[PDB]
Design a protein around this motif. Sequence first.
Motif, PDB file in Angstrom:
ATOM      1  N   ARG A 264      47.984 -24.805   4.489  1.00  0.00           N
ATOM      2  CA  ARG A 264      48.281 -23.867   5.598  1.00  0.00           C
ATOM      3  C   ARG A 264      49.709 -23.361   5.425  1.00  0.00           C
ATOM      4  O   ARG A 264      50.546 -24.138   4.934  1.00  0.00           O
ATOM      5  CB  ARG A 264      48.045 -24.293   7.024  1.00  0.00           C
ATOM      6  N   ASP A 265      50.028 -22.207   5.937  1.00  0.00           N
ATOM      7  CA  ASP A 265      51.350 -21.617   5.808  1.00  0.00           C
ATOM      8  C   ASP A 265      52.237 -21.798   7.055  1.00  0.00           C
ATOM      9  O   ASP A 265      53.207 -21.090   7.304  1.00  0.00           O
ATOM     10  CB  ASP A 265      51.222 -20.120   5.574  1.00  0.00           C
ATOM     11  N   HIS A 266      51.874 -22.801   7.831  1.00  0.00           N
ATOM     12  CA  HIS A 266      52.637 -23.206   9.014  1.00  0.00           C
ATOM     13  C   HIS A 266      52.421 -24.711   9.226  1.00  0.00           C
ATOM     14  O   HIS A 266      51.298 -25.209   9.130  1.00  0.00           O
ATOM     15  CB  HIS A 266      52.162 -22.382  10.249  1.00  0.00           C
TER      16      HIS A 266
ATOM     17  N   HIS B 211      42.285 -22.034  11.416  1.00  0.00           N
ATOM     18  CA  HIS B 211      42.011 -21.070  10.345  1.00  0.00           C
ATOM     19  C   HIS B 211      42.443 -21.775   9.061  1.00  0.00           C
ATOM     20  O   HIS B 211      43.096 -22.824   9.181  1.00  0.00           O
ATOM     21  CB  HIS B 211      42.780 -19.758  10.525  1.00  0.00           C
TER      22      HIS B 211
ATOM     23  N   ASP C 240      43.898 -20.933   5.064  1.00  0.00           N
ATOM     24  CA  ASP C 240      44.520 -19.914   4.254  1.00  0.00           C
ATOM     25  C   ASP C 240      43.772 -19.917   2.907  1.00  0.00           C
ATOM     26  O   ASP C 240      43.497 -20.977   2.377  1.00  0.00           O
ATOM     27  CB  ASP C 240      46.019 -20.215   4.135  1.00  0.00           C
TER      28      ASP C 240
ATOM     29  N   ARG D 159      47.504 -13.739  -0.070  1.00  0.00           N
ATOM     30  CA  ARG D 159      47.044 -14.694   0.921  1.00  0.00           C
ATOM     31  C   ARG D 159      46.222 -14.118   2.044  1.00  0.00           C
ATOM     32  O   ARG D 159      46.435 -12.932   2.370  1.00  0.00           O
ATOM     33  CB  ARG D 159      48.300 -15.261   1.629  1.00  0.00           C
TER      34      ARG D 159
ATOM     35  N   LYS E 293      43.818 -15.086   5.794  1.00  0.00           N
ATOM     36  CA  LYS E 293      43.540 -16.145   6.774  1.00  0.00           C
ATOM     37  C   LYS E 293      42.096 -15.939   7.205  1.00  0.00           C
ATOM     38  O   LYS E 293      41.741 -14.848   7.659  1.00  0.00           O
ATOM     39  CB  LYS E 293      44.272 -15.714   8.082  1.00  0.00           C
TER      40      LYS E 293
END
Lengths: 245, 258
Positions: free
Chosen positions: B134-136, B142, B144, B153, B155
């Motif tokens: 994940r980008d967080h 969701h 990635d 990238r 989502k």
Amino acid sequence: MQAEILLTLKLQQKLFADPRRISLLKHIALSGSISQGAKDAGISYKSAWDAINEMNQLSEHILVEAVLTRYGQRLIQLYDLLAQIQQKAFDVLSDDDALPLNSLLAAISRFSLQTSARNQWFGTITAQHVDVLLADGKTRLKVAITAQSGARLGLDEGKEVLILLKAPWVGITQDEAVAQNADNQLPGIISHIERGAEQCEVLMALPDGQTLCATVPVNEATSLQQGQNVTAYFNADSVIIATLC
Amino acid sequence: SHMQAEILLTLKLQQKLFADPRRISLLKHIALSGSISQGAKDAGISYKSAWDAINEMNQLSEHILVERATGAVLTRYGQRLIQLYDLLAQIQQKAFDVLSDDDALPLNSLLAAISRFSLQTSARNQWFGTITARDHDDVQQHVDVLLADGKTRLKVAITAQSGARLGLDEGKEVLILLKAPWVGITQDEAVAQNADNQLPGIISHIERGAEQCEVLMALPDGQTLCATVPVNEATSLQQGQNVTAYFNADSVIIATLC
Ligand code: NI
């Protein structure tokens, strides 16, 4: 039962690739040299050169630059693919209860391929859209799709199809006047309702066995009760249909 | 796009050679000719090596491949072996054409082979990609996805539960199935900047119709994005126009092997 597959590729009627050359390439990648590579792969240095030069010429690419080029790596990837699927292929072959083999990619992908759609049903093309009969034999659907996508999917009378429908693309109504104006209508009984702060998951038992999942805005689900017979409804153009050939 | 490879497969069972070109060719000529002896002669092999091959193949496979016609015929298993061999060879030929033509999907991936050679869907978009971190730090519902450049990238909405069942951990290979009418195409960055996903590009092809305009653009990894936009809304578009494609995270369906 131990089982394996060996591949040889020929181009212009000559020898292009064979396990011993692929092992030469891989030992080259590993070792960072042609001479060490040949030694590790068990062949003479001159013979490692002859192979690399023949491969380059017959393919018209460059395979070794020591490192492999991209073309060289993907040649190994094409061997690795075969090795990824062989055991599936042998299991398909030894399957004494299966019907006749049509498509090996479709056979190895029938039961493994899964999706994130909560509604995933099998059907057949019965006789701008197509009509699909579900697998429990009675349910018909209408699926919007051009004549041309239909051609690209191979949509003939009887072609097996996979039908995909996200839960939030499904409407739930207790009013026959709402349902009757929908493209697709699936009567069923609510078997579970789960109410959240914005959404409500509905599961419905279709008359013929499977369970339909719908996800509706909570304020539209207020009067609904488990036990109740309702109608799930959806546009013909909400459904995604897939085929494997 | 030139030069077809000649595919030679050898199947081996129990450490032993089971079926190779010459043995498959014997079994087809048996099927074509109705007899072991005419079939061995058509396949260019003696009678004795023909029965040596069939006795061996029977013994290794634990089936009978060829039986007297109730004249010789292939059994169900003899036919299934030839079919499986020839489909297998055809998959290596199409993989060879991919090597020769290039594309950015991995050529060792099974999902990518299915996507190129077998699977077709009504959505028109069917992009290969891999689950990435994940980008967080925060968990959101969701996953990635990276496209085949390992850089662009996307989502996709899904729950932890369906993510879990589908095995969606870093590096899992999936396809992104996205209907074309759910993809916007804009020359205005701010319009797209309001959607979960933006994919810059250049119109590689446009087709206009009475209600809908079909637009095609190359994604940064070579894969092709297809969008269907209202002809009202497509009047200013043209090939080579730099464009952004955009869509919601919950418009996608992910397909993957399990
Ligand atoms: Ni994310």
